Amino acid sequence: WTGWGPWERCTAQCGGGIQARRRICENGPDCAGCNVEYQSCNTNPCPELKKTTPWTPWTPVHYEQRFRYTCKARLADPNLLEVGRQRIEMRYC
Amino acid sequence: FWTGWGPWERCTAQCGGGIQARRRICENGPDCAGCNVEYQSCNTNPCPELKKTTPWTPWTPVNHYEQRFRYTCKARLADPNLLEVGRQRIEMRYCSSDGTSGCSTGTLEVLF
């Protein structure tokens, strides 16, 4: 066996991944041991990415009020977090 | 000599790519002519788009009809515990004696 190679690219930036190192056994078809080794990488929990919903329209209570929420997700990419459309529910008085 | 291969065991992740491991044992030997553990990909399907609903806003009149609002938080994750909705943030304002003024009629401009 040759010297073990450096650990390659980690799969994910956070929340668990795998990192690989490899080696080659020159002039040997079946050598002693494994040519490839794996390890866990970036085992830190992913940051709690957050996005805010749009404000609701102003409605009277003379005071007028409106509301918004925040969508919190443990993600490695903000593009994987999205806020859906506004749902209006109406009934008569 | 190597013994029979073991089961593929457990996938690393539920979705988005993982590794499954199976093993064997070199009987009466420290160094057999192979690798004791074998890997294969598992659960390469993309993770589902989980959706959670925000709490409803209080019912409010329109002008007689009453309305309320909510949104949906969508995230591609393998675990629902990693998606949550934050606290409701309320912003108010004063409409004063006009009932409108800055709330609805903006800046009243009169030309004399």
Numbering used by the authors:
A (entry chain A): 656 to 716, 724 to 755
B (entry chain B): 655 to 717, 724 to 772
Lines from the paper:
Semaphorin-5A (Sema5A) is a bifunctional guidance cue exerting attractive and inhibitory effects on neuronal growth through the interaction with heparan sulfate (HS) and chondroitin sulfate (CS) glycosaminoglycans (GAGs), respectively. TSRs are a unique feature of Sema5s and enable interactions with heparan sulfate (HS) and chondroitin sulfate (CS) glycosaminoglycan (GAG) chains linked to the protein core of proteoglycans. We determined four Sema5ATSR3-4 crystal structures to high resolution (1.56–2.72 Å); apo state and complexes with nitrate, sulfate, and the heparin disaccharide mimetic sucrose octasulfate (SOS). Sema5ATSR3-4 is a rod-like dimer; superposition of the various structures indicates TSR3-TSR4 inter-domain angle differences, which may contribute conformational flexibility to the Sema5A ectodomain.
The novel architecture of TSR4 supports two symmetrically positioned ~20 × 20 Å-sized shallow cavities on the opposing sides of the Sema5A dimer. Positively charged and polar residues (K505, T732, K734, R747, R749) from both monomers contribute to each of these sites, together providing a notable positive electrostatic surface potential. There is an absence of clear electron density for key Sema5A GAG site sidechains, R747’ and R749’ in the apo Sema5ATSR3-4 structure. The conformational flexibility of these residues is consistent with an adaptable binding site that can accommodate GAG binding partners in vivo.
